[PDB]
Structure 1
Amino acid sequence: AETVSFNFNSFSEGNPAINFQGDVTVLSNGNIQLTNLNKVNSVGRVLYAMPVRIWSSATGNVASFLTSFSFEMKDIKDYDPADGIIFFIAPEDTQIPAGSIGGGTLGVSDTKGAGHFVGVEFDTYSNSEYNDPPTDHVGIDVNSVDSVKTVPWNSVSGAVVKVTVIYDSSTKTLSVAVTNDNGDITTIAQVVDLKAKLPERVKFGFSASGSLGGRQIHLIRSWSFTSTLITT
């Protein structure tokens, strides 16, 4: 089997294993801050630096993965706690969209909310333009921030959220388990064919954005990941 595994309990500036795109900063405590509270339409992205081969054209196999991470979103005076975080998977050449407006685009889509990526979002602002449900919600995104499926949720300022995602290559099922600070769990599952929506080599990371009036603290506290491809 072909396996890729890593575990970050904290992050540091200058580790060749991570790629920073946009407004990302490394806090003195090892946390990663995704956006700049002082910039308009801020966008920050972090990616595992090595591309992962998620499917093989040779054999036809699709990797299975298990990953877990925890984050925290915190309110700041005078700005609308917006817009959220997104765990995403994109082609190896991935970059922040050319004239990114940030905001409800979450840093992975164009103005109309389209892009090339598969991801799980934690959205804290309702964009009628992207058909967002009326409350905070978790969503499964396939090439658009106009989620294929969403589930009501509640973002608590200063709360640490823990997340678990399992991607079962055979049923092509992607399942997510979110642990609220309060103990309750939130789950959402959806069949998504990675072999059909993405190249053989991809990048994994997190993205967050803000707007002019819409700004909040976005922190990535830990991330562990493992993928296994049944080789030839």
Structure 2
Amino acid sequence: VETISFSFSEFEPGNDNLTLQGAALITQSGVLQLTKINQNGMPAWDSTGRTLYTKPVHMWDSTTGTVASFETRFSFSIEQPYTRPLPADGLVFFMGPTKSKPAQGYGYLGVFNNSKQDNSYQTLAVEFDTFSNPWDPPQVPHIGIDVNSIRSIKTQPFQLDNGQVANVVIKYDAPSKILHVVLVYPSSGAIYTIAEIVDVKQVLPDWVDVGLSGATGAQRDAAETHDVYSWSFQASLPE
């Protein structure tokens, strides 16, 4: 069995295992701020940032045809402090081609280039979307399962508990081809669940980079924080 696992109970500036892109940075307090937090402590608009684990993950064996199952968990908080305009844009966990660089920001969340489906993205992502774009369901925030497109194949509305920490659990089971996602707010006790069929051998390249990305909006104060406190990941490829 070929495995890979990692766990960050908190983040530390200078950590060997994380690539930081765009606006993303790690605070001395141990927080990964995906998008820029200004001097005052307010989130800046027009910001996009990502982090990637430094080692690629083997998701399926192009010789035997075996497919990996994985699990990932992270805790994040989104605070929307402006009364106007509408907050934007959200954060996302993603898996895609290695040597990945940030794509477009705003509603594309630093992961996709435009709003069309393109199998060449070879990317799977689980979004926590805060702004309803032309391709989105109306309810925001929502969790979305994105397969080669920012237009989710399935979404689940969730109520934001402003500024509070949410816990996320994402599992992909290769036998069933089920990607199942859970979001829990300890603060309020709210629990949300969403699941969909994803054929990773068809969707992803055999080796992938895994990461997190966040983005704020395209106009003044269409923004919010996208802070991550911890992140663990584990994958197992049968041999």
Q: Same fold (TM over 0.5)?
A: yes
Q: Does 1:112 align with 2:118?
A: no
- Ranges in structure 2 where 5+ consecutive residues have no aligned partner: 39-43
Kindly state the Cα deviation for residue 44 of structure 1 after the two structures are TM-superposed: 0.2
Look up the equivalent residue of 1:122 and give its one-letter code: F
1:36 aligned partner: 36
Secondary structure of the residue aligned to 1:190 is: strand
Please tell me whether the aligned partners of residues 25 and 34 of structure 2 are also in contact (alpha carbons under 8 angstroms): yes
1:89-104 correspondence runs (5 A): 89-97=95-103, 100=104, 102-104=105-107
Aligned twin of 1:156? 161
TM-score by length of 2: 0.90
Give me the CA root mean square deviation. Answer: 1.6
Larger deviation, residues 18-27 vs 71-80: 71-80
Residue type at the aligned position of 1:3? T
**1:228 aligned residue (209, 213, 236):** 236
Cα distance change of structure 1 residues 42 and 191 upon mapping to structure 2, 3 Å threshold = same
Q: Deviations over 1:71-103 (max 9, x none)?
A: 001123466421111011011021112xx2x21
C-alpha separation in 1, matches of 2:111 and 2:71: 22
Find the aligned partners of 1:193 and 1:124 in 2 and give their Cα distance.
Answer: 27
Aligned to 1:134: 139
Displacement of 1:138: 0.7
Does the 8 Å CA contact 1:132/1:146 hold for their aligned counterparts?
A: no
Deviation for aligned residue 1:114? 4.9
Q: For the structure 1 residues 150 and 8, does the alpha-carbon distance in structure 2 shift closer, same or farther, using more than 3 Å as the test?
A: same
Farther off after superposition, 112-121 or 199-208: 112-121
Partner of 2:41: none
Report the number of matched residues. 227
- What is the aligned partner in structure 2 of residue 88 from structure 1? 94
Change (3 A) 1:113 1:26: farther
Q: Contact (CA 8 Å) 2:115, 2:151: kept in 1 or not?
A: no
Q: Which deviations, in whole Å up to 9, do the C-alpha atoms of 1:196-220 show, x marking residues without a partner?
A: 0111100111111112231111101
Relative to its length, the structure with more strand (as a share) is 1
Question: 1:8 maps to which residue?
Answer: 8
Q: Of 106, 118, 123, which aligns to 2:129?
A: 123
- Per-residue CA shift, 1:32-64, capped at 9, x if unaligned? 001124665211000111001110011100111
Q: Name the aligned partner's letter for residue 44 of structure 1.
A: G
The structure-2 alpha-carbon separation of the partners of 1:23 and 1:114, relative to structure 1 and needing over 3 Å to count, comes to farther
Alignment of structure 1 residues 38-77 onto 2, 5 Å: 40-77=45-82
Gaps of 5+ in 1: none
**Which whole-Å CA distance do the structure 2 matches of 1:14 and 1:3 have between them?**
25
Q: In the TM superposition, what is the alpha-carbon distance from 1:118 to its structure 2 partner?
A: 0.5
TM-score (norm 1): 0.92
- What is the aligned-residue identity percentage? 41
